[PDB]
């Protein structure tokens, strides 16, 4: 039989029903998986798709790195082609870390398959300027960028504890480190200058759709004022709920506290 890898390495899953569909997107170092505490909660009410990217699942029989993934324009092209292939009509699309702003980019070109946009732990820049503040000098991002080819094996578990907040014994820091091994070395740096390259920053006036920022108060991978720059900064309506957490990834460390802020921006319109 003949071959096709376009549906293997998107990992295309659907559950649930209803009018409206839910799509689901996630950051660096991490898959669909990540969104484990929500989709139970979604399924009644909502068709919900998920989908992978930034070279996740690396190692496996067939996964070739295509060269749309060398930046976020193309990633959000690619969102652009699944929403089509699917049929989707109007969407409320949620958004981790970087796929936040993709999905940003594609609203821009197709403002009628979004009825919405919710953030979570957003950034259009991670860099420092002299006006803007990202979070990072330049010895913060290469300190991190060095370790990662002389050995992805301590790099994984030094890096997964720093992004994801708390003690290292938690279930979240281990399922980040088990989701940063599926990826190959090489594949991880690539990506990773992508991210620290990024800027989207001028994107931003050109949203019209309602969009949601949410973050936790400590991220160590974003300032809590980079939430009120987006709000500041997007075309259309929009509204900010900095949650009292910790980490990066708080939808799988603080469900508890992330899991009905998601469902109440998911569920109301800006109130």
């Given at each position: 039989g003949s071959m096709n890898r376009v549906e293997a390495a998107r990992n295309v899953h659907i559950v649930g029903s209803g009018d409206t569909?839910?799509?689901?997107?996630?950051?660096?170092?991490?898959?669909?998986?990540?969104?484990?505490?929500?989709?139970?909660?979604?399924?009644?009410?909502?068709?919900?798709?998920?989908?992978?990217?930034?070279?996740?699942?690396?190692?496996?029989?067939?996964?070739?790195?295509?060269?749309?993934?060398?930046?976020?324009?193309?990633?959000?092209?690619?969102?652009?082609?699944?929403?089509?292939?699917?049929?989707?009509?109007?969407?409320?699309?949620?958004?981790?870390?970087l796929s936040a702003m993709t999905g940003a980019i594609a609203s821009i070109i197709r403002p009628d398959l979004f009825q919405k946009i919710v953030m979570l732990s957003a950034s259009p820049?991670?860099?420092?300027?002299?006006?803007?503040?990202?979070?990072?000098?330049?010895?913060?991002?290469?300190?991190?960028?060095?370790?990662?080819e002389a050995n992805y094996k301590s790099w994984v578990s030094g890096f997964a504890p720093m992004v994801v907040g708390?003690?290292?014994?938690?279930?979240?820091?281990?399922?980040?480190?088990?989701?940063?091994?599926?990826?190959?070395?090489?594949?991880?740096?690539?990506?990773?200058?992508?991210?620290?390259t990024s800027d989207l920053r001028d994107y931003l006036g050109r949203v019209t759709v309602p969009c949601?920022?949410?973050?936790?108060?400590?991220?160590?991978?974003?300032?809590?004022?980079?939430?009120?720059?987006?709000?500041?900064?997007?075309?259309?309506?929009s509204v900010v709920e900095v949650m009292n957490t910790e980490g990066h990834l708080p939808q799988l460390s603080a469900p508890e506290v992330a899991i009905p802020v998601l469902l109440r921006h998911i569920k109301n319109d800006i109130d």
């Open positions: 569909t839910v799509v689901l997107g996630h950051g660096f170092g991490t898959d669909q998986s990540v969104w484990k505490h929500l989709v139970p909660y979604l399924v009644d009410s909502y068709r919900v798709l998920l989908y992978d990217n930034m070279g996740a699942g690396s190692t496996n029989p067939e996964y070739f790195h295509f060269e749309r993934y060398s930046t976020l324009q193309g990633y959000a092209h690619d969102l652009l082609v699944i929403l089509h292939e699917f049929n989707i009509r109007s969407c409320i699309f949620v958004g981790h870390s820049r991670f860099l420092n300027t002299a006006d803007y503040l990202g979070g990072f000098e330049p010895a913060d991002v290469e300190q991190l960028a060095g370790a990662i708390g003690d290292m014994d938690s279930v979240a820091v281990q399922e980040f480190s088990r989701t940063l091994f599926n990826m190959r070395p090489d594949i991880a740096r690539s990506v990773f200058r992508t991210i620290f949601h920022i949410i973050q936790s108060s400590r991220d160590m991978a974003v300032p809590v004022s980079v939430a009120g720059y987006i709000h500041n900064r997007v075309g259309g309506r």
